[PDB]
């Protein structure tokens, strides 16, 4: 039985299923200092969140890192690729759930539904009367998708049924789609009033949503981020909201989670979520299964189910 390390917290469903084929080794945090000599025969890792390189490099027989999540920016994939270590993620099983969350965050940002519920709950409806009318609406809006992969496309499909115009920006266009392609992010922003960020947390997208992009978005502009916090210049966003450069924002992700800058918490036109895009029991169970099934497919057939693009590897064993 190959020995699989699980560092820090993970969904119990992963832990429950590992014993189908593996021996599990647990450490309470993703920290190289917790590794003992008895753990040097570890062949795989299952992890949610950050995998620091020194921890990854504590294991000479490491073959595979199974990442819990579609995003795998916590794993140093360049260093894993250099060591011949396959990295897997969890795409597809969460696509529709993340897309639903995106829509719910957008509607909450535009229509202030969470604030309206607080108004009611605080007893305000009875004595101060109706919750104020939301200055914004989805009606008449034009939505620009920054990124348009499996999730971006699922969001667009939902948006078509709400009667809004859809545009998108990607490095290279997609043939056979009726949505307006924009070759630049800034160009798309000028054209639209609602910008939904749904790209990976890469070097290429770092602070891509910046002062200029927000300024082009305009004074009715709404920013929704369900991608990675690093993609938005958090300082420029705060300034833009302060100045009324844009009208509102809804954020599921932040530069340095779980910390959210105090200035963002003060705005009445902002909706904030603690990275809940895939966070339902059913979808996290499917994600858990895919982490485990990837490990099982690797060790039993030598082919992972959902290796990442940087590591299209096949298992070599003596």
Ligand X SMILES: Nc1ncnc2c1ncn2[C@@H]1O[C@H](COP(=O)(O)OP(=O)(O)OC[C@H]2O[C@@H](O)[C@H](O)[C@@H]2O)[C@@H](O)[C@H]1OP(=O)(O)O
Q: Annotated binding residues for NADPH, as ranges?
A: 148, 150-151, 171-172, 226, 252, 275
On whether the CB atoms of residues 198 and 176 are closer than 8 A, the answer is no
User: Per-residue x/- mask for a second copy, residues 8 to 37, rule CB under 8 A?
Assistant: -x----------------------------
Nearest to 304 by CA among 177, 312, 42: 312
Query: Binding partner of residue 204 among a second copy, Cl ion, ligand X, none, CB under 5 to 8 Å per kind?
Result: ligand X
Which range in 79-87, 106-114, 236-244, 274-282 contacts Cl ion by CB under 5 A?
A: 274-282
Q: 275 — alpha (psi -120 to 50), left (phi > 0) or beta?
A: left
The footprint of a second copy on residues 115-144 (CB under 8 A) is 116-121, 125-126, 129-131, 133-140
Question: Hey, what are 76's tokens?
Answer: 């140093």
For position 269 contacting a second copy by CB under 8 A, the verdict is no
Q: Residue from 149, 187, 218, 261 that binds ligand X (CB under 6 A)?
A: 149
Size of the site for a second copy (CB under 8 A): 56
What 3-state class would DSSP assign to 247? Answer: coil
What 3-state class would DSSP assign to 294? Answer: helix
Q: Residue 79's CB: how many other CB atoms inside 10 A?
A: 13
Q: Residue from 48, 194, 205, 288 that binds ligand X (CB under 6 A)?
A: 205
Which range in 21-29, 99-107, 143-151, 297-305 contacts ligand X by CB under 6 A?
A: 143-151
The whole-angstrom separation of Cα 313 and Cα 309 is: 10
The whole-angstrom separation of Cα 159 and Cα 103 is: 8
Residues near ligand X (CB under 6 A) are 70-71, 91, 95, 147-152, 169-172, 198-202, 204-205, 227-228
């Amino acid at each position: 039985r190959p020995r699989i390390l699980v560092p820090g917290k993970i969904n119990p469903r992963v832990l429950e299923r590992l014993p189908e084929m593996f021996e599990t080794v647990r450490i309470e945090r993703a920290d190289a200092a917790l590794v003992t000599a008895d753990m040097r025969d570890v062949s795989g890792i299952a992890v949610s969140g950050k995998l620091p390189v020194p921890l990854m490099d504590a294991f000479p027989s490491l073959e595979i890192v199974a990442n819990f999540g579609v995003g795998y920016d916590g794993v140093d994939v360049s260093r894993a690729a250099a060591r011949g270590i396959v990295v897997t993620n969890t795409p597809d099983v969460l696509t529709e759930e993340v897309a639903d969350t995106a829509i719910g965050l957008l509607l909450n940002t535009l229509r202030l539904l969470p604030q309206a519920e607080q108004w009611l709950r605080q007893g305000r409806w009875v004595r101060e009367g109706a919750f104020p009318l939301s200055p914004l609406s989805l009606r008449g809006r034009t939505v620009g998708l920054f990124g348009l992969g499996r999730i971006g496309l699922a969001i667009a499909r939902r948006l078509e049924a709400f009667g809004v115009s859809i545009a998108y920006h990607t490095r290279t266009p997609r043939e056979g789609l009726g949505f307006t392609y924009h070759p630049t992010l800034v160009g798309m922003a000028e054209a639209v009033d609602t910008l939904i960020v749904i790209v990976p947390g890469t070097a290429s997208t770092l602070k891509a949503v910046n002062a200029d992009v927000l300024s082009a978005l305009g004074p009715k502009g709404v920013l929704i981020n369900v991608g990675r916090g690093s993609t938005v210049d958090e300082a420029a966003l705060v300034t833009a909201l302060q100045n009324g450069t844009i009208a509102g924002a809804g954020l599921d992700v932040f530069e340095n989670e779980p910390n959210v800058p105090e200035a963002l918490l003060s705005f009445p036109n902002v909706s904030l979520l603690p990275h809940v895009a895939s966070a339902s029991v059913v979808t996290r169970n499917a994600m858990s299964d895919l982490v485990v099934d990837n490990l099982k497919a690797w060790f039993s057939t030598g082919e992972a189910l959902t290796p990442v693009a940087e590591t299209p590897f096949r298992r070599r064993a003596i």
